[PDB]
Design a protein around this ligand. Structure first.
Ligand SMILES: Nc1ncnc2c1ncn2[C@@H]1O[C@H](COP(=O)(O)OP(=O)(O)OP(=O)(O)O)[C@@H](O)[C@H]1O
Ligand SMILES: Nc1ncnc2c1ncn2[C@@H]1O[C@H](COP(=O)(O)OP(=O)(O)OP(=O)(O)O)[C@@H](O)[C@H]1O
Ligand SMILES: Nc1ncnc2c1ncn2[C@@H]1O[C@H](COP(=O)(O)OP(=O)(O)OP(=O)(O)O)[C@@H](O)[C@H]1O
Ligand SMILES: Nc1ncnc2c1ncn2[C@@H]1O[C@H](COP(=O)(O)OP(=O)(O)OP(=O)(O)O)[C@@H](O)[C@H]1O
Ligand SMILES: Nc1ncnc2c1ncn2[C@@H]1O[C@H](COP(=O)(O)OP(=O)(O)OP(=O)(O)O)[C@@H](O)[C@H]1O
Lengths: 16, 535, 415, 125
C-alpha cells in the first residue's frame, strides 16, 4: 500500500 | 463623457497579428457604451461584464489586458496575482473576495446609472476557480471561494458598472457555471501567428533602432519573416535582443578588468551576420519539426544515381497537390515499400519537407524505447490530435514492423497497436481540414496477411542499384576513387549485374578505405563479391 | 556606480575548464548593464532576468553561481535551499514566495530606472517547480506555488531590476512556461572537461602548495593530466586532498598516545609516490574505468596457441581504427561467434581494453538475476544513456542468448 | 442530435435499383417495430463487400425514422481502450436507450469492435 499523503490545516482564533 | 481616452491610437499600443481578435472584442464589449445613450435605452439591453483569454504560453494575453486597461477612461484597475486571496483563518478568503466589489456597489447605489466603469483583472484564474467537488484535500475553502465569487458576480442585487477579465492556460479545468452567458461571455483564443503577423511583430520590435539609424542597411525583414517559422512573439523579441547583445559585445574587453572603448561605441551598427549567428546558436523554437530533426533523418543528403530517384519525388509531389486541392477526399494515404537498406526514411522525410505545410510531424519507434502497448497508443493518439487541431497537416510513420513488435517465430505482435492504426487510417478530421499520411515498411507480405494493405490509397516502390552503370555513377557522385582506380573497377563490374543498397555501399567504401593504398580496390571488390545477389 | 566591482579579476574566480560558458553568460546577461545608458535607451531593449544551469553531479554549478553572486556590486543575494518554503497552513507557502520580491518592487516604485540589482538563487529548483497536471482529478500536490512564481516573475506590473539563477540535475521535469524566452532565457549544460581543463584545474588546486615550496620536484602535472581521463572537478580535488593526507600522516604516531614529531614537520614535502598510491587505492571515477573488471573477465590471461588469435586481434584493431577516424559512419557494430568454451568474451574484453577509449563499459547478465523484462530494458537504457555523454565510447554485450531468456523447448523468449 | 453530416459526407445518389430496395426494407422493418406488441425487439444485419456504403445507408435508415431516441456506437471513440471499457460504454448506451418508449441503436464495424485478426486468429471474447 501507499502511505496517505501530507495534508494542509485550517485554524481558528479565540478572544480573551 | 466618453469612456475612451481622447489621445488614444491603435498603433500606439504596439500589438501585431491580433487585429481580428481585437475587432471582435471591441464589437462585443464596448459597442454599447460608446453609442448614444437614448437609443440604447430605447433598446433596453444590458452591458457585457466578462472576458476570458486562453492559449499557449508566450502569445500576448497579459499585453492585451494591460493595454485594454490603459485604453479606458476610468479608475485604476484592480489586479489579483494568482492565489493572493488564500488565508489560514475561517471566513478570511471570502472577505478578501467581497472587498473587491465594495466601491462598485457604493457608486451604483449612490449615482445609479450615471456612474463610471470599474475594472478587475484575474491573472492565472485557473488556480482559484475549478469545478466544484474535485479536490480530495483542502476543498472546504475552495468550494466556498467559488460559491462566493459566483454569488458576487451575478446575484439578487444587480450591478451595471463592472468588467472582469481572466487569462488562463488550462481552460478545461474551470467551472462551467462561471462561463455561462451573463458572467463570462466573450471567450477568445490567442495562438501562433502566420507570416504576415510575424512580419508585423518584427517591424514593431525594430522601430526605434531604425529611427535612430542604429540598424544596418543589409538587413531584410522579409527574409527573417520567411525564415522564422513556428516562432511566437516572445521568441521573435528574444532574437532581436540576442542580436543587439552580439552587436554590443564587440566594444567590451574583459580579460583582467572590464573596459569599454567609448570611441568606437559611437558608430555602432547591427548587421545581418549577428542575426544569422543568433538564429543558429541561441534561439530555438519549441514547436513542430525543426532543422535538428532533418539533420538526423537525412544525414548524407540525396544523390541522383538513377531515374527512379526522380520518379518517387514526382509521385510524392502529385499526391501532395491532390491533398492540397481536392475537397471530396480530405484524407489521403500512401505506403513506401522496398528491400532493406534502400533509403525509404530519407525519401519520406524529403517529401514531407518539400510539402511546405504548416504542420509536419514524424512518429518513430526510437523515441519510445521500452514502452508498453498503452503508452505507444497514447503517444500516437496525442500526435494525431495535435495534427487534427491544424488546418492542413502531414504525418509520417516509419518502420511500421517495429511499431508493432513483429518476430517471425510464433509469430508474435501487438494487436492493440494494430487495431489503433487500422482505426486511425480511416478517420477524417473536422470538416474543412485536410491531412496527409505517409508510411514506410520493409515487409509488405506480412502487412498483406494482417489486412492492412487495403487501408492505404496507393503504394510506391523503392528499388536497389541493379546495374554497373548506376554503381559507377554513384561512385563518381561520391568522389571516393580516382579515375585510375575506377577504370579497374569498371573492368570488373560492367560485365555483371549488381544488387546493392545505397546504405550498404557507404559502409563498404569506409571499410575498404582502412586498407593500405595498395590494397583498397582489391578489398572493395572482395567485399562486393561476398555480397552476392538475390533480385 | 559601475555594476562590476572595481577589484574584480577573472583569475581570482578559481574556475578552470569553462571559458566558453562564462563568455556566453557574460555576453547574454551583463553586456547591456555595462554599456553606456544613453545608447541603450535609444535601442528600447529590456534586460535578461533568468539563467538555468544543468548537468551531472560534481562539475561546478554551485561554485559558478556563488562566484557570479560575488562578482557583482549589489545587495547581498537571497538563497533558497530546496523545499525551504513549504508550510502546513493554507496560504502560507505562497506568502513565502511573495516575500522574496518585496524589496525589488519597493525600490523600483521609488527610484525608477536608477535602482540597483537584486539576485535570487534557487538550489534544487525541481523540488518545487514540476509540471502542472492539467487534467481533472490529477491535479498536482501544489500547483499554486508554481502559479505564484509564474505570476511574480512576469506579470501585469513590470520589474527591470531582478536576476534569478537555478540549478538542477533533472531538467526534463521542469514546467514549460517557466523556461520561455521571457522568464529563464539562458540555459547552459556543465559537463566533463577535457585534458586542457584538467590541467587548468590541477594548476588552480596546486598553486598555493607551489607557492611555499611544499611540493617535491619529481612531480609533473602534465603527466597527471594525461593519466586522469574522464574525471570531474571534484575528483581531482579529492585526489590532491588524499595525497596531502598521506604526506601528513608520516609524521604522526598513534597507539598509546597521539604525538607529532614537531622537528621533521619542517622538512615536509609531497612526492610522486603519494599521488600514485592515491590513484590506486582511494579515488575511483564514475565515467572512467578501472583495472579490476578486466581482471574479472580476463582471468587466466591470453596465450598465442595458433594463427586465429592474431587474425581476431587484427580484425578488432581495424574496426577500432575505422570508428575513430570515420565521419560518414559514426556507429559500427560487430558480432563474435563460435562454439562453446572457445573463449570469445575474453577476446572481446582484450579488444576493448586495447582500444584505449576514455569510456568503456560491459553489460552482463550476471547483474540481472531475477529481473523482469521491464527492469532489464531500463538497465540497458541506463547503460546506453551514460555513453552518449562522451566523445568516444565502446560497449560490450555479452551472452545475448542469456539476455533474451531463450530455451529450445516451445521455444520461449522475451520479445 | 447525432452529427449525421460526418457519417453521410457526400449524400446518396440512386445509381441503380438496389438502393431503393434497401431503403424500402428498412422502412418496412421500422413499421414493424412501431406497430407490434408480440415482438418488442427486432434486429437486422447489413452485409456486403468493402467500399459499398453500408454505414451511410444505415445512418439514412436510422434518420428517416422519427423515434425520440437515436444513437450510434462506433469504434472511432474507443481507441486504446481495454476490453472492459468497451463493455462499460456499450452497457451505458443501452441503459440510456432503455429509458425511452421507442429506441433505435446502430452498431457499426462489428469486426473492429471485437479486435479480429485472421492470424491465429485473435479476438476479444
Ligand atoms: N502579439 C504580440 N505582439 C508583440 N509582442 C508580443 C506579442 N505577443 C507577445 N509579445 C511579446 O512577448 C512578451 C511576453 O508576452 P506575454 O507576457 O503577453 O505573454 P502571455 O501569453 O501572457 O504569457 P504566458 O502564457 O507565458 O503567461 C510581451 O511582453 C511582448 O514583449
Ligand atoms: N538517393 C538517396 N536516397 C536515399 N538515401 C540516400 C540517398 N543518397 C544518400 N542517402 C543516404 O543513405 C541513407 C539512407 O538510409 P535510410 O535510413 O533512409 O534507409 P532505410 O532503407 O530506411 O533503412 P533500413 O532498411 O536499415 O531500415 C541516409 O544516410 C541517406 O542520407
Ligand atoms: N570546474 C571546476 N573548477 C574548479 N574546481 C571545481 C570545478 N568543478 C568542481 N570543482 C570543485 O568541486 C567542488 C564541488 O563542486 P560543486 O559544488 O560546484 O558541484 P555541483 O555541480 O553543484 O554538484 P551537485 O550536482 O552534486 O550538487 C567545488 O567547490 C570545487 O572545489
Ligand atoms: N588465447 C586465449 N583466448 C581466449 N581465452 C583464453 C586464451 N588463453 C587463455 N584463455 C582463458 O580462457 C578462458 C576463456 O573463457 P571464456 O569465459 O572467454 O569462455 P567462452 O568462450 O565465453 O565460454 P562459455 O560462454 O560457453 O562459457 C579465460 O580464462 C581466458 O583467460
Ligand atoms: N448511393 C450511395 N450509397 C451509399 N453511399 C453513398 C452513395 N453515394 C455516395 N455515397 C457516399 O459513399 C460513402 C459510402 O460510405 P462509407 O464510406 O461509410 O462506406 P462503407 O462501405 O461502410 O466503408 P468501409 O469499406 O470503409 O467499411 C459515403 O461517403 C457516402 O456518403
Amino acid at each position: 500500500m501507499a502511505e496517505d499523503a501530507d495534508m494542509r490545516n485550517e485554524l481558528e482564533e479565540m478572544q480573551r | 463623457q466618453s469612456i475612451i481616452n481622447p489621445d488614444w491610437n491603435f498603433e500606439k499600443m504596439g500589438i501585431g497579428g491580433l487585429d481580428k481578435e481585437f475587432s471582435d472584442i471591441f464589437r462585443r464589449a464596448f459597442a454599447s457604451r460608446v453609442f448614444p445613450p437614448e437609443i440604447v435605452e430605447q433598446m433596453g439591453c444590458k452591458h457585457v461584464k466578462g472576458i476570458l483569454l486562453y492559449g499557449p504560453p508566450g502569445c500576448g494575453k497579459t499585453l492585451l489586458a494591460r493595454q485594454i486597461g490603459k485604453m479606458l477612461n476610468a479608475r485604476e484597475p484592480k489586479v489579483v496575482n494568482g492565489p493572493e486571496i488564500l488565508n489560514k483563518y475561517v471566513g478570511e478568503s471570502e472577505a478578501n473576495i467581497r472587498k473587491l466589489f465594495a466601491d462598485a456597489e457604493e457608486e451604483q447605489r449612490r449615482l445609479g446609472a450615471n456612474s463610471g466603469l470599474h475594472i478587475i483583472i484575474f491573472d492565472e484564474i485557473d488556480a482559484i476557480c475549478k469545478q466544484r467537488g474535485s479536490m480530495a484535500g483542502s476543498t472546504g475553502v475552495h468550494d466556498t471561494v467559488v460559491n462566493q465569487l459566483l454569488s458576487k458576480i451575478d446575484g439578487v442585487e444587480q450591478l451595471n458598472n463592472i468588467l472582469v477579465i481572466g487569462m488562463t492556460n488550462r481552460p478545461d479545468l474551470i467551472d462551467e457555471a462561471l462561463l455561462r452567458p451573463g458572467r463570462l461571455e466573450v471567450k477568445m483564443e490567442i495562438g501562433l501567428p502566420d507570416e504576415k503577423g510575424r512580419l508585423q511583430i518584427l517591424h514593431i520590435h525594430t522601430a526605434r533602432m531604425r529611427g535612430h539609424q542604429l540598424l544596418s542597411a543589409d538587413v531584410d525583414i522579409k527574409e527573417l519573416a520567411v525564415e522564422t517559422k513556428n516562432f511566437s512573439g516572445a521568441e521573435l523579441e528574444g532574437l532581436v535582443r540576442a542580436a543587439q547583445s552580439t552587436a554590443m559585445n564587440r566594444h567590451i574587453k574583459a580579460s583582467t578588468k572590464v573596459e569599454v572603448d567609448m570611441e568606437k561605441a559611437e558608430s555602432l551598427q547591427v548587421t545581418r551576420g549577428d542575426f544569422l549567428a543568433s538564429l543558429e546558436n541561441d534561439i530555438k523554437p519549441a514547436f513542430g519539426t525543426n532543422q535538428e530533426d532533418y539533420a538526423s533523418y537525412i544525414m548524407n543528403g540525396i544523390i541522383k544515381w538513377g531515374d527512379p530517384v526522380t520518379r518517387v519525388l514526382d509521385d510524392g509531389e502529385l499526391l501532395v497537390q491532390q491533398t492540397k486541392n481536392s475537397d471530396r477526399t480530405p484524407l489521403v494515404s500512401v505506403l513506401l515499400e522496398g528491400p532493406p537498406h534502400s533509403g525509404k526514411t530519407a525519401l519520406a522525410a524529403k517529401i514531407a519537407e518539400e510539402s511546405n505545410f504548416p504542420f509536419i510531424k514524424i512518429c518513430s519507434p526510437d523515441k519510445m524505447i521500452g514502452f508498453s502497448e498503452t503508452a505507444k497508443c497514447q503517444a500516437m493518439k496525442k500526435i494525431f490530435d495535435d495534427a487534427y487541431k491544424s488546418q492542413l497537416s502531414c504525418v509520417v510513420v516509419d518502420d511500421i514492423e517495429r511499431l508493432l513488435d513483429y518476430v517471425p517465430i510464433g509469430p508474435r505482435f501487438s494487436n492493440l497497436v494494430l487495431q489503433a492504426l487500422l482505426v486511425l487510417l480511416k478517420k477524417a478530421p473536422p470538416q474543412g481540414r485536410k491531412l496527409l499520411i505517409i508510411g514506410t515498411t520493409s515487409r509488405k507480405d506480412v502487412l498483406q496477411e494482417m489486412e492492412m494493405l487495403n487501408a492505404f490509397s496507393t503504394t510506391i516502390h523503392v528499388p536497389n542499384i541493379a546495374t554497373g552503370e548506376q554503381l559507377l555513377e554513384a561512385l563518381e557522385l561520391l568522389g571516393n576513387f580516382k579515375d585510375k582506380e575506377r577504370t579497374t573497377i569498371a573492368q570488373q563490374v560492367k560485365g555483371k549485374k549488381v544488387w546493392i543498397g545505397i546504405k550498404k555501399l557507404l559502409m563498404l567504401i569506409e571499410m575498404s578505405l582502412q586498407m593500405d593504398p595498395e590494397y583498397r580496390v582489391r578489398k572493395f571488390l572482395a567485399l562486393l563479391r561476398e555480397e552476392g545477389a538475390s533480385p
